[PDB]
């Protein structure tokens, strides 16, 4: 329903055609007044797509408002430098250093147009949320969404109630472990909203999502490939379609070389067999998970418990 938007006049670079396609998709997402999840593969330049989106919003519209970027520290420095390289048109504030230096970076920050975008860190904002919460954010971007993949984690709780117009997640893959991560990301994009004292929900709840979706997916994973199964997976695909975005590396990167997978089964040794049997016998009746970790340590190497002794002579204290 959209087309290639004009390249920003303030964008200093040469994006690829598919980069422009992603930029158009994000532009459509913002113009739809909605939020979305980026799930494109690594190396494609999710940082580049984010800076391109910022440039588009600034250039076409008046969308130059304060924007929040949260990144892990090393990737934070890399992001800041890459932001300088691609689109230096925004006076970027780098949150960094000792708390005194943090206060110094803060001084006089409320003056309009003193900064255009701020880059912060996940644990840094987890500690210093009380400072940031006061001002709303025009456009929020969440790099490395796998860091907030846990709904239980205090990071998700701290970042959940933030006041912003539109938000964007960046992840290589939204589902590392289970459907719970998927729900956490989705509901982070579309949480409950309050208007005139009412409770309005954007998405369903975690228990609601798992009840209405996960059990059919549990049946899916129970047995490989059943009209109900196909209907359920199609329903999941169609509900996930409007908010996801992912380009596979295979088709876009046609110059990639091949890959092969190999499996080798290694037999146990006598010491390993004895230690494994003893630990399993002790664990049959204590806690069970610590015993599982000990069994894995047996499987790794027997030296993790006791090394073979360095035999040496007994020493008498004093001769007769």
């Amino acid at each position: 329903s959209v087309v290639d938007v004009p390249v920003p006049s303030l964008l200093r670079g040469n994006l690829r055609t598919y980069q422009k396609q992603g930029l158009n998709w994000l532009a459509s997402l913002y113009n739809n007044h909605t939020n979305g999840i980026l799930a494109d593969e690594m190396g494609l330049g999710k940082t580049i797509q984010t800076i391109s989106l910022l440039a588009y919003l600034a250039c076409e519209k008046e969308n130059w408002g304060p924007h929040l970027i949260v990144v892990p520290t090393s990737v934070l420095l890399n992001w800041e430098m890459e932001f300088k390289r691609f689109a230096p048109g925004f006076k970027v504030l780098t949150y960094y250093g000792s708390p005194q230096q943090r206060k110094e970076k803060r001084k006089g920050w409320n003056k309009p147009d003193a900064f255009h975008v701020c880059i912060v860190s996940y644990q840094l904002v987890v500690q210093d949320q009380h400072s940031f919460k006061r001002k709303r954010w025009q456009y929020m971007v969440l790099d490395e969404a796998h860091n907030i993949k846990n709904f239980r984690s205090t990071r998700w709780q701290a970042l959940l109630n933030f006041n912003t117009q539109r938000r964007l997640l960046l992840t290589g893959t939204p589902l590392q472990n289970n459907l719970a991560e998927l729900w956490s990301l989705l509901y982070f994009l579309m949480p409950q909203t309050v208007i005139d004292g009412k409770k309005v929900s954007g998405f369903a709840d975690l228990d609601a999502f798992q009840q209405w979706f996960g059990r059919p997916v549990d049946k899916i994973i129970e047995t490989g490939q059943d009209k109900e199964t196909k209907k359920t997976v199609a329903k999941l695909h169609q509900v996930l379609r409007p908010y996801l975005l992912r380009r596979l590396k295979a088709d876009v990167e046609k110059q990639m070389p091949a890959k092969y997978e190999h499996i080798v089964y290694c037999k146990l040794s006598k010491r390993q067999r004895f230690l494994y049997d003893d630990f399993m016998s002790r664990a049959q009746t204590m806690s069970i998970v610590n015993c599982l970790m000990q069994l894995r340590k047996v499987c790794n190497h027997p030296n993790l418990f006791e090394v073979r002794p360095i035999l040496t002579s007994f020493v008498l204290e004093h001769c007769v």
């Binding site: 303030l10 300088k84 390289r85 230096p88 048109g89 925004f90 006076k91 147009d113 255009h116």
Partner: protein
């Protein structure tokens, strides 16, 4: 509320300052990498300073009949000097 034209002017000033910072960063990075390479080279050059050195060399030497004749002539001249 500053207008979009004044906004673009401020953005251009920011672009100029950012270009300055970027070239400074590039120079710093080049300096760091070159210094690391120089330190590695200095580590590789660990030897006695300004001392006399005795060297023993053995190598395969190519020969031609003209060179053999020249060597024989040198031997004959040395014998004549004797």
């Amino acid at each position: 509320m500053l207008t979009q034209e004044e906004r673009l002017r401020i953005a251009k000033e920011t672009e100029k300052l950012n270009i300055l910072s970027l070239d400074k960063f590039k120079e710093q990075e080049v300096w760091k990498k070159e210094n690391r390479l120089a330190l590695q080279k200095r580590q590789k050059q660990k030897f006695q300073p300004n001392e006399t050195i005795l060297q023993f060399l053995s190598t395969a030497w190519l020969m031609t009949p003209a060179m053999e004749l020249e060597d024989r002539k040198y031997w004959q001249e040395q014998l004549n000097k004797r």
